[model samples]
Target: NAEALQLNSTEVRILGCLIEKQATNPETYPLTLNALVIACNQKTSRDPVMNLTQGQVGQSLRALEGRGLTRLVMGSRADRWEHKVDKGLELVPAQVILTGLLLLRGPQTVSELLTRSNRMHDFEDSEQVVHQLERLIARGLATLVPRQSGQREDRYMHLIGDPEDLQD
Candidate 1:
């Protein structure tokens, strides 16, 4: 099975963080890069087989983005990121959060999602929040709600899916 394939160090770290975030908040599918990085570094320090560096971690994120396994969006200060999963790779963290946010808050502006997600994760940075939201919009898993205002502000929501059918 795909899950049985050996993962490189970066893949291992990214997957580990996704698993942790998903375990803690199954309803919330995706995790921001900051959150995932923190989780990976912390987990690596505790685990015997998964040592990683900050640069290497960044590289891993890039790899995921390249493969459409993750998405990056614009936030207040930096970019926000989350996993992209469909059908076979359903265990992605971003999907969980996207679903929860859509269900709990309904359609929200990109800024709103960032603020809410940051509050959920204790992050503070509008730029970073927006960056991630942009990435999600680029991916098919999420959609942007258009506004009449002249400003570039936009709302976001997740597409519906069967929770049980998600990859585990």
Candidate 2:
């Protein structure tokens, strides 16, 4: 299954950066190597902020391309890259945003997702967010984090890994 696929840290970040830049800066949606490196290193919104090198990101992009999740384009002066996550994951914009957030920022609640995804999608209400998530879960595209005491809602995480990797 697609959700059972395991992606290394670099792959996750590379894909995450593509998702992010697509929403936050469409002007630079299909990012070049240097732009991607910068996007991956940004301190805001990302959980466990990283300092990814151009070499590492490039390597991961190549691997993702091989997996049909990323695409490389020939720019006028430099080649640009884009995420083919839509087809690779069979996801829409909202789904892409939610999944990408999970890949980059770890687990979160519906409230957290709606708020954090503001830049990517303008989910009108909590019910709408829940509906989309339910669909993803139904499709086996995501998994949940158990609700914590004193916390009202359970958090959710991506199922982007081998079945044996995170059975927890």
Please report, in order, the local distance difference test score of every candidate based on alpha carbons. 0.53, 0.84
**lDDT per residue (tens digit) for residues 1-168 in model 2:** 343568887788888889988998999979999999988888987777999898899888998899899999986789889998888888888899988888788878888898889878989988988888888898887877777688888898777754454566
Location of the lowest summed lDDT over 10 successive residues in candidate 1: 159-168
Candidate 1, after superposition: displacement of residue 66 in Å? Answer: 1.1
* TM-scores of the models, in the order given: 0.41, 0.92
Candidate 1 residue-wise lDDT, 17-132, digit = tens? 56446545655446666666676666322233444666777787887777666677666766656655433345334444444444333457656655555534432566655555
lDDT of the structure predicted as candidate 2: 0.84
Q: CA shift at 70, candidate 1, in angstroms?
A: 1.0
The segments of candidate 2 whose C-alpha lies over 4 angstroms from its true place after superposition are: 1-3, 162-168
